[PDB]
Structures are given as C-alpha cells and as structure tokens.
Scaffold this active site. Structure first.
Site, PDB file in Angstrom:
ATOM      1  N   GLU A  44      -9.569   6.928  -4.474  1.00  0.00           N
ATOM      2  CA  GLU A  44      -8.829   7.242  -3.236  1.00  0.00           C
ATOM      3  C   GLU A  44      -7.652   6.292  -3.034  1.00  0.00           C
ATOM      4  O   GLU A  44      -7.826   5.069  -3.070  1.00  0.00           O
ATOM      5  CB  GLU A  44      -9.695   7.181  -1.970  1.00  0.00           C
ATOM      6  CG  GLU A  44      -8.821   7.118  -0.718  1.00  0.00           C
ATOM      7  CD  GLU A  44      -9.545   7.367   0.596  1.00  0.00           C
ATOM      8  OE1 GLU A  44     -10.678   6.864   0.787  1.00  0.00           O
ATOM      9  OE2 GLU A  44      -8.952   8.049   1.461  1.00  0.00           O
ATOM     10  N   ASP A 109     -11.499  -9.889   3.434  1.00  0.00           N
ATOM     11  CA  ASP A 109     -10.235  -9.908   4.165  1.00  0.00           C
ATOM     12  C   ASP A 109     -10.312 -10.977   5.251  1.00  0.00           C
ATOM     13  O   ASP A 109     -10.943 -10.774   6.291  1.00  0.00           O
ATOM     14  CB  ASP A 109      -9.930  -8.523   4.749  1.00  0.00           C
ATOM     15  CG  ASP A 109      -8.720  -8.514   5.679  1.00  0.00           C
ATOM     16  OD1 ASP A 109      -7.955  -9.503   5.748  1.00  0.00           O
ATOM     17  OD2 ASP A 109      -8.533  -7.496   6.363  1.00  0.00           O
ATOM     18  N   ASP A 111      -8.686 -12.965   8.134  1.00  0.00           N
ATOM     19  CA  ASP A 111      -7.674 -12.650   9.139  1.00  0.00           C
ATOM     20  C   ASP A 111      -7.436 -13.880  10.026  1.00  0.00           C
ATOM     21  O   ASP A 111      -8.374 -14.398  10.636  1.00  0.00           O
ATOM     22  CB  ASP A 111      -8.209 -11.489   9.974  1.00  0.00           C
ATOM     23  CG  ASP A 111      -7.185 -10.902  10.928  1.00  0.00           C
ATOM     24  OD1 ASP A 111      -6.226 -11.590  11.342  1.00  0.00           O
ATOM     25  OD2 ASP A 111      -7.370  -9.725  11.294  1.00  0.00           O
TER      26      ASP A 111
END
Ligand SMILES: [Zn+2]
Length: 400
Positions: A44, A109, A111
């Site tokens: 995807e 991830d 942040d």
C-alpha cells in the site's frame, strides 16, 4: 511553517518527482531483492494531494509504474503502509474479507510534541538546537536496544522534515512479526507512561534491568549540557517545583530550601542527587540508591513510545524522501554513525534543491540532497549483503 510561499509547492513537486526523487534506490528498498513474488506489487502507498485530500490503497506494478503515477499526481505527501494479501489497488474485487495486511517493517515515530511536558525552550509547534538533543538520545536509546537487545540488523532512521524522527526496522523476520509481538517489543522498550494528568510518569523497581541501565548511561552523556545548561530545568521556583512533584513529600522541604541557596541548575542537581540518594523507602529498608535521580532523568530525556504506531501492521507512515509540505524540507535518512552531528535545520528544502538543480534539469547528485541518498544507499547495500549471506546458508543446506 511558514518559510516559503505554499503556492509554489505544486511546480516544485512536479520538478522534484521528475528529476530529483531517487526512484532506483527507493525501488531497491521496497522490492527487497525481488525474490519474494508480488512483495512490491502488494505494498500500500497512500498519496496526499492538495487540501489534505488523500487516497488509500494505491499500489504499483513496478518502478516505472510508480514513477509514472507519482509524476502524474505529484502528491504533497507519500505514506507507506503494509504489504497485503492482494494488490491494494484491487481490494474491492476481493472475497468477503480475504484482503488482509500481511507484512510490514516494524516502525517507530518519535514526536517532539510528546516531550512538551518536559520542554522549556522554544514552543509546542517548534524545535530548536536546545530540544533537538531529545531526538539524538531517542535514536541512540532505541537503536542500541533494537540492535543489541533484539538482534535487528536493518534499521533505517529518518527525519520527518519537521518535528519527528522515524525508525524502519526492515529485517526479513521483523517484517513478518505479529501485532502481539510488536506490542511486546514496545512494552520492553517503554519507561515513560503515560497520561495527561499523571504528574509522575516513571516508577523504577529496586532491581535494575540492563535495558534501564544502558539507557540511563546514554542519557548521562547528555544530561548536564542538555538539561542543566540548555533547558535549565531547575532555573527558578516555577520550574523546579515541577521536579519536586516527582520526589516524595518527605523531602519536598529540605530540597526547596537548598535550591534557594544555590544559583545554578548545575549546583541544585548535585544537591538533588545527594538528597535523593539518602531517601529511605519508608521504612525498615537500609537499602539506598539512585532510583529517584534516574526517574527524573528518564521523565525528562527518555522517548515516549506510542503503542499504536508500532502495533498495527496496517498503520501508514510518511515515506523517506517525501517532502514535508509545512516546512518544505525533504524527509531524509539519518546516518547513525554521525547521529550527534545530524542537523535538522540545514536539511534542504524542495525549493532550495530545485534551485540548485538548474543553477548554472538533470540529477540529484548536483544538489544538497546527494549526501542523504548516499546514506540511504549504505542502508540498501547492507540489505543486499544480508540477502546474499542468507542465500549462501540456504544453498549450503540444499547439498546433502
Ligand atoms: Zn526547543
């Protein structure tokens, strides 16, 4: 945000995807040696276009097809999802519920906004040389563990182009890992938990696991310069009361008094270590140590790990070499050998490299993008070396 006119983004993007985006290296990555059939064709991709409009479940037949479509749609952002049981771009044609996410890189991830509770320097929507060290520490802490504690050999670290730092772990076996096992990895790595109105977010046990020790040792290399000098975490009453909410009632007052007699955060921290090391876990104990000091350091310096980023096989994450539309910066690989020198602020913008390209349209090597592609290539080279190495072992098993 905002440093250039956003209405020039479409024309810069058009040139970027035509001459600059490194398709060969990118395909080499996601095709993974081409040895598993359909592996790229079943990936995807999710494009974001203008006005925050995005498309789910795009997929491509090969490098040329991807180039053609990226050059046709000129996306603001490219996200990468899982490898599915079927071509994502035909998912509607598929039986009842046979369309399933099967494989994906294990991703992290980190942040910068997740550190807002322990940042004092710039602002929630910013980063600066004073808070960046948080990312440096997050990289060294998580990468050491992934490498040493789990044996993962293929870890690509990526700057988001703004306020984030991403890891893609790409080992053949890792990509196949279940959600449950991914959670287990997150659980093992997690120390800072984890609520809006929980004041104290780290609680250590008497017994120290090597993971905690080794993470603390990394933070200790940075803590003075980062927390005491740069952040100046014990500067004034307003700020050191935040640290005092992390220590027991028993010592709130003694610490308060000697904090006001000293002038540095440096001096006050030395006093905190002394006092905290003499705290008795009431009572009957006789055993003393650094747990409290360690808990404060971990709360200020240890990465917060969102469970969902790493747990869901289908989760989308911004592609390396995608542009950050808010800053114009290219999302680039971070060289792990040089992590301490990595500078998010000199990472070039799309406009800058487009300018370089035609300053007296050819190739990415004549721009500031080049060193970052070299970093990507070394990563890809290691993936090549491994596949060949494992194919030799497999070939030696087919001999008896
Ligand atoms: Zn800052």
């Amino acid at each position: 945000m905002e440093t250039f006119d956003p209405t020039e983004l479409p024309e810069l993007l058009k040139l970027y995807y035509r001459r600059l985006f490194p398709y060969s290296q990118y395909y080499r990555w996601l095709n993974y040696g081409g040895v598993i059939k359909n592996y790229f064709q079943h990936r995807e991709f999710s494009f974001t276009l203008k006005d925050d409009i995005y498309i789910r479940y795009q997929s491509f037949n090969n490098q040329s097809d991807l180039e053609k479509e990226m050059q046709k749609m000129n996306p603001y952002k490219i996200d990468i999802g899982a490898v599915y049981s079927h071509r994502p771009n035909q998912h509607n044609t598929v039986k009842l519920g046979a369309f399933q996410a099967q494989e994906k890189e294990l991703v992290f991830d980190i942040d910068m906004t997740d550190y807002d509770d322990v940042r004092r320097c710039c602002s929630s929507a910013d980063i600066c040389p004073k808070c960046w060290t948080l990312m440096t520490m997050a990289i060294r802490i998580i990468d050491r563990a992934l490498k040493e504690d789990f044996g993962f050999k293929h870890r690509l670290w990526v700057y988001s182009g703004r306020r984030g730092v991403h890891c893609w772990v790409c080992d053949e076996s890792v990509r196949k890992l279940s959600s449950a096992v991914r959670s287990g990895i997150v659980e093992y790595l997690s120390l800072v938990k984890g609520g809006q109105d929980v004041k104290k977010k780290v609680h250590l046990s008497e017994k120290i696991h090597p993971f905690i020790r080794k993470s603390i040792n990394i933070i200790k290399k940075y803590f003075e310069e980062y927390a005491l000098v740069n952040q100046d975490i014990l500067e004034n009453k307003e700020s050191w009361d935040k640290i005092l909410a992390l220590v027991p009632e028993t010592i709130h007052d003694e610490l308060q008094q000697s904090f006001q007699k000293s002038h540095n955060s440096l001096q006050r921290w030395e006093h905190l270590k002394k006092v905290a090391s003499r705290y008795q876990n009431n009572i009957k104990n006789d055993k003393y140590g650094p747990w409290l000091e360690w808990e404060i350091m971990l709360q200020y310096c240890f990465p917060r790990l969102d469970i969902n980023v790493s747990k869901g096989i289908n989760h989308l994450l911004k592609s390396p070499f995608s542009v950050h539309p808010k800053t114009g910066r290219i999302s680039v690989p971070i060289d792990l050998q040089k992590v301490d020198q990595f500078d998010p602020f000199t990472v070039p913008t799309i406009s800058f490299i487009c300018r370089e390209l035609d300053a007296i349209t050819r190739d990415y090597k004549k721009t500031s993008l080049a060193p970052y592609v070299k970093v990507f290539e070394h990563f890809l080279e290691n993936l090549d070396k491994s596949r060949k190495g494992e194919l030799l072992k497999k070939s030696d098993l087919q001999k008896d």
